[PDB]
Amino acid sequence: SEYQTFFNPRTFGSGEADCGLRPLFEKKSLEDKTERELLESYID
Amino acid sequence: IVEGSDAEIGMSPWQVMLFRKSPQELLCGASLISDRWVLTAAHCLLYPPWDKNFTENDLLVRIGKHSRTRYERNIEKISMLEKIYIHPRYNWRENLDRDIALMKLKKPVAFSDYIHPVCLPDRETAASLLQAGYKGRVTGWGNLKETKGQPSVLQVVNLPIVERPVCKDSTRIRITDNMFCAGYKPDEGKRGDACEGDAGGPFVMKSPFNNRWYQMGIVSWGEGCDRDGKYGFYTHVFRLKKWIQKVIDQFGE
Amino acid sequence: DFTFDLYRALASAAPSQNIFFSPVSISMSLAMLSLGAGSSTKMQILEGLGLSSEKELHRGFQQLLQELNQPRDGFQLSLGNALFTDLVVDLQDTFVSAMKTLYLADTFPTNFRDSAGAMKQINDYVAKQTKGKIVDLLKNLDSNAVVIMVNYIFFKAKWETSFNHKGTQEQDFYVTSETVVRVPMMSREDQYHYLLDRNLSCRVVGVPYQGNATALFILPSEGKMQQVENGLSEKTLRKWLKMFKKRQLELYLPKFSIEGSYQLEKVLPSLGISNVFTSHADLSGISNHSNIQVSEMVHKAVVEVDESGTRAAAATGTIFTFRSARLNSQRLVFNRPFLMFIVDNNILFLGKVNRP
Ligand SMILES: *[C@@H]1O[C@H](CO[C@@H]2O[C@@H](C)[C@@H](O)[C@@H](O)[C@@H]2O)[C@@H](O)[C@H](O)[C@H]1NC(C)=O
């Protein structure tokens, strides 16, 4: 999962580098019940 | 949230609940973007005509929650606020343009399986994801219907982004580029919308390019909830990113 | 100030009783009286009114009386002044003229040696002038009166925002912790100018009338009425008006008519204005006769509080709707003795509603 940080931890605090990856889903290779609907909306 | 469903545990770990105090009650939704910063809507905190002006000392935030009313031991965290920053050009007199506020936690919150920050979009991700037809997700503990009808647990609803011309024709209010609208069209056969109590919450989208969740918007205003031919409006997070950066740089340390 | 010293004097003389009068109306009455007074008699009156220049003083009231005379179709205000003088009292042209010109007040020769007759003459005149709103001004006219000054004022205006007459319901009113009475309680949840005075320990709510006039209702905290009364002053009033903040309230206010009738000759002396009510009164401006004095100075104020307002009171505000949670509503119930002010640029009315 490629991500380039934009903020500076000195003022932003921690957490940006690993942002948006959920411990109980992405990090466990598990999908929630409706995210497939979102991914399917990108098909055109 | 109208026509949504119960969120799964840890499904929205960046979800933040904003409260007022003495008496303490749900005020709005909000989102965690780091262990010291939280995003919400300006109208959750300030509205001169009603003498509404919630400051750090009048608020508190609960993080890592699922239940709307039950305290969740060793899971939820309560964080006081050090300071709040509302966009100086938040247009409360007309259309709630730039409906955004940043809140700095008095003490950093520890991450867990239930508390984790959401990403803010870079230019490419915003251009790639914030497009008409693509669906994003809104979460909150607000009312289930326009007209006490409150959910037992965090609600979630997926909604499609709407073309700007359609958003504009749907309301008499002057829409700006710092706003976008979302929701299903009368002919799409499905429903859903944010409602009273959901303001300040996040409108997120999952990037298929890096599998990460990005907060594209902040639940802002609407006209009623889930009405035919109407759409909910959201603060365009990317367009206000320069302001976010400025505020964080000036007050973050 | 004088207005508040008088308030306390009246409340002290009649404890646990309704108190209600018009401060500006009494000030006018005194100013008018000073036109025929002299020496120390006049000085006491002026000091009482806390008085720039006399010419300015009278000019102000003359104009003010003209304005309150403009039938503003949104108010019901009847203000009047009149002097009844015994038949034998020779009146000075200058005084009679100044009264009619500056205060639009007439002087009427009266046969006070015929109480019943004079009393009916006076009451009938007042009733006529107040369109029937202020009747039976006098209830007991002491014989051998020399001069009787009467000051009356009726008021009833539409609220800026109406009270749904369908929301008005009879409720319990605690005149005391032991005495309860049923009174029609109006109500309306909405935003009101509100303030919590921790110093005096009372809650103050402002309810505006159609225009620049507003009513202030003060609910002291349990057992603090006396404490609030003692704190009443121009300074305190100014403060309240300045610290007001719009607040969502579930307001419960009694629907009522309140009146107050006072023999000011019995209270003003203790406030410094005594000479004019004695045999050594210097009223050389009114008459060249030596036994001239104000026998009685009657003031009667009547105000009616109802639901009537300008607009239907509702909706509006903005086209968009907030998605933040609705404002928390606080409960403010006036079900025990409260104070009331009605103010424009001046204090039109001040009183204590001990029993609606
Ligand atoms: C919001 O309030 C801020 C602080 O106001 C002051 O402190 C509070 C506790 C009250 O005592 C209030 O009367 C004081 O003025 C202001 O600095 C700020 O301007 C207010 N919001 C805005 C921008 O109007």
PDB file of N, CA, C and O in Angstrom, chain B residues 181-224:
ATOM      1  N   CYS B 181     -22.114  17.569  -3.516  1.00  0.00           N
ATOM      2  CA  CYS B 181     -23.313  16.957  -2.970  1.00  0.00           C
ATOM      3  C   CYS B 181     -23.354  15.488  -3.365  1.00  0.00           C
ATOM      4  O   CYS B 181     -22.717  15.070  -4.334  1.00  0.00           O
ATOM      5  N   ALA B 182     -24.077  14.694  -2.583  1.00  0.00           N
ATOM      6  CA  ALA B 182     -24.164  13.270  -2.851  1.00  0.00           C
ATOM      7  C   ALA B 182     -25.537  12.746  -2.456  1.00  0.00           C
ATOM      8  O   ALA B 182     -26.234  13.337  -1.624  1.00  0.00           O
ATOM      9  N   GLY B 183     -25.911  11.637  -3.070  1.00  0.00           N
ATOM     10  CA  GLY B 183     -27.199  11.049  -2.787  1.00  0.00           C
ATOM     11  C   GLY B 183     -27.772  10.466  -4.054  1.00  0.00           C
ATOM     12  O   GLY B 183     -27.332  10.762  -5.171  1.00  0.00           O
ATOM     13  N   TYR B 184     -28.779   9.629  -3.876  1.00  0.00           N
ATOM     14  CA  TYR B 184     -29.414   8.996  -5.005  1.00  0.00           C
ATOM     15  C   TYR B 184     -30.500   9.822  -5.651  1.00  0.00           C
ATOM     16  O   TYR B 184     -31.098  10.721  -5.065  1.00  0.00           O
ATOM     17  N   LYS B 185     -30.569   9.672  -6.970  1.00  0.00           N
ATOM     18  CA  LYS B 185     -31.528  10.424  -7.762  1.00  0.00           C
ATOM     19  C   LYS B 185     -32.842   9.682  -7.719  1.00  0.00           C
ATOM     20  O   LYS B 185     -32.868   8.467  -7.545  1.00  0.00           O
ATOM     21  N   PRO B 186     -33.957  10.409  -7.870  1.00  0.00           N
ATOM     22  CA  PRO B 186     -35.300   9.829  -7.845  1.00  0.00           C
ATOM     23  C   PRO B 186     -35.446   8.573  -8.697  1.00  0.00           C
ATOM     24  O   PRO B 186     -36.160   7.645  -8.324  1.00  0.00           O
ATOM     25  N   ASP B 187     -34.752   8.543  -9.830  1.00  0.00           N
ATOM     26  CA  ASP B 187     -34.830   7.410 -10.747  1.00  0.00           C
ATOM     27  C   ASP B 187     -33.840   6.276 -10.483  1.00  0.00           C
ATOM     28  O   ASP B 187     -33.871   5.256 -11.169  1.00  0.00           O
ATOM     29  N   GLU B 188     -32.964   6.441  -9.496  1.00  0.00           N
ATOM     30  CA  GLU B 188     -31.987   5.401  -9.202  1.00  0.00           C
ATOM     31  C   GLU B 188     -32.510   4.265  -8.320  1.00  0.00           C
ATOM     32  O   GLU B 188     -31.821   3.266  -8.111  1.00  0.00           O
ATOM     33  N   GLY B 189     -33.727   4.421  -7.807  1.00  0.00           N
ATOM     34  CA  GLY B 189     -34.337   3.376  -6.998  1.00  0.00           C
ATOM     35  C   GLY B 189     -33.856   3.099  -5.584  1.00  0.00           C
ATOM     36  O   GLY B 189     -34.448   2.268  -4.896  1.00  0.00           O
ATOM     37  N   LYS B 190     -32.793   3.764  -5.141  1.00  0.00           N
ATOM     38  CA  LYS B 190     -32.282   3.553  -3.786  1.00  0.00           C
ATOM     39  C   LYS B 190     -32.354   4.857  -3.000  1.00  0.00           C
ATOM     40  O   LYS B 190     -32.547   5.921  -3.588  1.00  0.00           O
ATOM     41  N   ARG B 191     -32.210   4.781  -1.677  1.00  0.00           N
ATOM     42  CA  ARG B 191     -32.258   5.996  -0.859  1.00  0.00           C
ATOM     43  C   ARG B 191     -31.103   6.089   0.137  1.00  0.00           C
ATOM     44  O   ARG B 191     -30.246   5.211   0.195  1.00  0.00           O
ATOM     45  N   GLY B 192     -31.098   7.160   0.925  1.00  0.00           N
ATOM     46  CA  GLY B 192     -30.047   7.337   1.912  1.00  0.00           C
ATOM     47  C   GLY B 192     -29.566   8.769   2.000  1.00  0.00           C
ATOM     48  O   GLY B 192     -29.472   9.463   0.983  1.00  0.00           O
ATOM     49  N   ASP B 193     -29.244   9.212   3.212  1.00  0.00           N
ATOM     50  CA  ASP B 193     -28.782  10.580   3.412  1.00  0.00           C
ATOM     51  C   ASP B 193     -28.293  10.747   4.846  1.00  0.00           C
ATOM     52  O   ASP B 193     -28.519   9.883   5.699  1.00  0.00           O
ATOM     53  N   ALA B 194     -27.596  11.845   5.104  1.00  0.00           N
ATOM     54  CA  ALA B 194     -27.159  12.139   6.461  1.00  0.00           C
ATOM     55  C   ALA B 194     -28.330  12.946   7.022  1.00  0.00           C
ATOM     56  O   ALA B 194     -29.235  13.324   6.271  1.00  0.00           O
ATOM     57  N   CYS B 195     -28.327  13.209   8.325  1.00  0.00           N
ATOM     58  CA  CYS B 195     -29.409  13.969   8.936  1.00  0.00           C
ATOM     59  C   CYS B 195     -28.961  14.641  10.231  1.00  0.00           C
ATOM     60  O   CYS B 195     -27.766  14.686  10.534  1.00  0.00           O
ATOM     61  N   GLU B 196     -29.917  15.175  10.985  1.00  0.00           N
ATOM     62  CA  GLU B 196     -29.627  15.864  12.241  1.00  0.00           C
ATOM     63  C   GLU B 196     -28.732  15.054  13.175  1.00  0.00           C
ATOM     64  O   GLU B 196     -29.081  13.951  13.586  1.00  0.00           O
ATOM     65  N   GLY B 197     -27.574  15.617  13.516  1.00  0.00           N
ATOM     66  CA  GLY B 197     -26.652  14.919  14.390  1.00  0.00           C
ATOM     67  C   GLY B 197     -25.473  14.298  13.656  1.00  0.00           C
ATOM     68  O   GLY B 197     -24.500  13.877  14.286  1.00  0.00           O
ATOM     69  N   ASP B 198     -25.543  14.256  12.327  1.00  0.00           N
ATOM     70  CA  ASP B 198     -24.460  13.669  11.530  1.00  0.00           C
ATOM     71  C   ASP B 198     -23.451  14.691  11.027  1.00  0.00           C
ATOM     72  O   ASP B 198     -22.390  14.310  10.536  1.00  0.00           O
ATOM     73  N   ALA B 199     -23.779  15.976  11.130  1.00  0.00           N
ATOM     74  CA  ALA B 199     -22.878  17.019  10.647  1.00  0.00           C
ATOM     75  C   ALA B 199     -21.516  16.850  11.283  1.00  0.00           C
ATOM     76  O   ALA B 199     -21.411  16.423  12.426  1.00  0.00           O
ATOM     77  N   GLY B 200     -20.475  17.190  10.535  1.00  0.00           N
ATOM     78  CA  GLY B 200     -19.131  17.067  11.077  1.00  0.00           C
ATOM     79  C   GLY B 200     -18.502  15.707  10.830  1.00  0.00           C
ATOM     80  O   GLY B 200     -17.278  15.562  10.899  1.00  0.00           O
ATOM     81  N   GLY B 201     -19.339  14.709  10.553  1.00  0.00           N
ATOM     82  CA  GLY B 201     -18.854  13.368  10.277  1.00  0.00           C
ATOM     83  C   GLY B 201     -18.157  13.273   8.930  1.00  0.00           C
ATOM     84  O   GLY B 201     -18.263  14.175   8.095  1.00  0.00           O
ATOM     85  N   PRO B 202     -17.463  12.167   8.668  1.00  0.00           N
ATOM     86  CA  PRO B 202     -16.756  12.017   7.399  1.00  0.00           C
ATOM     87  C   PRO B 202     -17.492  11.337   6.251  1.00  0.00           C
ATOM     88  O   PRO B 202     -18.321  10.457   6.467  1.00  0.00           O
ATOM     89  N   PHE B 203     -17.192  11.797   5.037  1.00  0.00           N
ATOM     90  CA  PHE B 203     -17.677  11.193   3.803  1.00  0.00           C
ATOM     91  C   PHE B 203     -16.350  10.605   3.314  1.00  0.00           C
ATOM     92  O   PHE B 203     -15.420  11.346   2.960  1.00  0.00           O
ATOM     93  N   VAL B 204     -16.236   9.283   3.329  1.00  0.00           N
ATOM     94  CA  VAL B 204     -14.989   8.644   2.922  1.00  0.00           C
ATOM     95  C   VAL B 204     -15.118   7.808   1.663  1.00  0.00           C
ATOM     96  O   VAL B 204     -16.215   7.416   1.268  1.00  0.00           O
ATOM     97  N   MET B 205     -13.981   7.562   1.026  1.00  0.00           N
ATOM     98  CA  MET B 205     -13.941   6.750  -0.173  1.00  0.00           C
ATOM     99  C   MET B 205     -12.722   5.864  -0.080  1.00  0.00           C
ATOM    100  O   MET B 205     -11.693   6.277   0.460  1.00  0.00           O
ATOM    101  N   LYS B 206     -12.840   4.642  -0.582  1.00  0.00           N
ATOM    102  CA  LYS B 206     -11.714   3.729  -0.561  1.00  0.00           C
ATOM    103  C   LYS B 206     -10.975   3.802  -1.882  1.00  0.00           C
ATOM    104  O   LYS B 206     -11.564   3.649  -2.956  1.00  0.00           O
ATOM    105  N   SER B 207      -9.675   4.065  -1.801  1.00  0.00           N
ATOM    106  CA  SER B 207      -8.857   4.147  -2.995  1.00  0.00           C
ATOM    107  C   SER B 207      -8.486   2.748  -3.473  1.00  0.00           C
ATOM    108  O   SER B 207      -7.936   1.948  -2.720  1.00  0.00           O
ATOM    109  N   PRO B 208      -8.787   2.437  -4.737  1.00  0.00           N
ATOM    110  CA  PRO B 208      -8.457   1.116  -5.274  1.00  0.00           C
ATOM    111  C   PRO B 208      -6.974   1.049  -5.628  1.00  0.00           C
ATOM    112  O   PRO B 208      -6.431  -0.028  -5.901  1.00  0.00           O
ATOM    113  N   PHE B 209      -6.318   2.206  -5.591  1.00  0.00           N
ATOM    114  CA  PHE B 209      -4.901   2.313  -5.933  1.00  0.00           C
ATOM    115  C   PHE B 209      -3.952   1.954  -4.793  1.00  0.00           C
ATOM    116  O   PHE B 209      -2.827   1.511  -5.037  1.00  0.00           O
ATOM    117  N   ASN B 210      -4.383   2.142  -3.550  1.00  0.00           N
ATOM    118  CA  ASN B 210      -3.539   1.764  -2.423  1.00  0.00           C
ATOM    119  C   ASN B 210      -4.329   1.123  -1.284  1.00  0.00           C
ATOM    120  O   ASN B 210      -3.794   0.875  -0.201  1.00  0.00           O
ATOM    121  N   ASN B 211      -5.603   0.839  -1.553  1.00  0.00           N
ATOM    122  CA  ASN B 211      -6.486   0.179  -0.602  1.00  0.00           C
ATOM    123  C   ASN B 211      -6.761   0.972   0.675  1.00  0.00           C
ATOM    124  O   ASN B 211      -7.219   0.408   1.663  1.00  0.00           O
ATOM    125  N   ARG B 212      -6.500   2.277   0.655  1.00  0.00           N
ATOM    126  CA  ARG B 212      -6.722   3.113   1.835  1.00  0.00           C
ATOM    127  C   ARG B 212      -7.975   3.974   1.784  1.00  0.00           C
ATOM    128  O   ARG B 212      -8.409   4.399   0.713  1.00  0.00           O
ATOM    129  N   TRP B 213      -8.538   4.240   2.958  1.00  0.00           N
ATOM    130  CA  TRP B 213      -9.716   5.093   3.064  1.00  0.00           C
ATOM    131  C   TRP B 213      -9.296   6.549   3.172  1.00  0.00           C
ATOM    132  O   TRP B 213      -8.441   6.904   3.993  1.00  0.00           O
ATOM    133  N   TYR B 214      -9.906   7.384   2.336  1.00  0.00           N
ATOM    134  CA  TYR B 214      -9.643   8.814   2.298  1.00  0.00           C
ATOM    135  C   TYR B 214     -10.895   9.599   2.641  1.00  0.00           C
ATOM    136  O   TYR B 214     -11.986   9.269   2.159  1.00  0.00           O
ATOM    137  N   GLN B 215     -10.753  10.643   3.449  1.00  0.00           N
ATOM    138  CA  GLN B 215     -11.903  11.468   3.775  1.00  0.00           C
ATOM    139  C   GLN B 215     -11.990  12.566   2.727  1.00  0.00           C
ATOM    140  O   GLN B 215     -11.167  13.487   2.695  1.00  0.00           O
ATOM    141  N   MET B 216     -12.993  12.456   1.867  1.00  0.00           N
ATOM    142  CA  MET B 216     -13.199  13.420   0.783  1.00  0.00           C
ATOM    143  C   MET B 216     -14.098  14.575   1.204  1.00  0.00           C
ATOM    144  O   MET B 216     -14.036  15.666   0.630  1.00  0.00           O
ATOM    145  N   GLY B 217     -14.943  14.338   2.199  1.00  0.00           N
ATOM    146  CA  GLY B 217     -15.830  15.392   2.647  1.00  0.00           C
ATOM    147  C   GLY B 217     -16.205  15.349   4.111  1.00  0.00           C
ATOM    148  O   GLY B 217     -15.893  14.394   4.820  1.00  0.00           O
ATOM    149  N   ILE B 218     -16.846  16.422   4.556  1.00  0.00           N
ATOM    150  CA  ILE B 218     -17.342  16.559   5.922  1.00  0.00           C
ATOM    151  C   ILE B 218     -18.841  16.785   5.770  1.00  0.00           C
ATOM    152  O   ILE B 218     -19.256  17.617   4.965  1.00  0.00           O
ATOM    153  N   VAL B 219     -19.648  16.036   6.514  1.00  0.00           N
ATOM    154  CA  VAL B 219     -21.098  16.215   6.425  1.00  0.00           C
ATOM    155  C   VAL B 219     -21.384  17.672   6.779  1.00  0.00           C
ATOM    156  O   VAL B 219     -21.045  18.141   7.865  1.00  0.00           O
ATOM    157  N   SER B 220     -22.007  18.385   5.852  1.00  0.00           N
ATOM    158  CA  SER B 220     -22.317  19.784   6.045  1.00  0.00           C
ATOM    159  C   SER B 220     -23.830  19.966   6.130  1.00  0.00           C
ATOM    160  O   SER B 220     -24.496  19.279   6.903  1.00  0.00           O
ATOM    161  N   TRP B 221     -24.373  20.879   5.336  1.00  0.00           N
ATOM    162  CA  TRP B 221     -25.809  21.146   5.380  1.00  0.00           C
ATOM    163  C   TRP B 221     -26.662  20.360   4.389  1.00  0.00           C
ATOM    164  O   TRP B 221     -26.166  19.617   3.539  1.00  0.00           O
ATOM    165  N   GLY B 222     -27.968  20.552   4.522  1.00  0.00           N
ATOM    166  CA  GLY B 222     -28.917  19.910   3.639  1.00  0.00           C
ATOM    167  C   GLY B 222     -30.208  20.690   3.776  1.00  0.00           C
ATOM    168  O   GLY B 222     -30.219  21.787   4.328  1.00  0.00           O
ATOM    169  N   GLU B 223     -31.293  20.133   3.257  1.00  0.00           N
ATOM    170  CA  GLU B 223     -32.605  20.758   3.366  1.00  0.00           C
ATOM    171  C   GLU B 223     -33.495  19.580   3.705  1.00  0.00           C
ATOM    172  O   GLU B 223     -33.930  18.834   2.828  1.00  0.00           O
ATOM    173  N   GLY B 224     -33.738  19.405   4.998  1.00  0.00           N
ATOM    174  CA  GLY B 224     -34.510  18.264   5.442  1.00  0.00           C
ATOM    175  C   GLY B 224     -33.560  17.086   5.311  1.00  0.00           C
ATOM    176  O   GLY B 224     -32.339  17.281   5.263  1.00  0.00           O
TER     177      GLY B 224
END
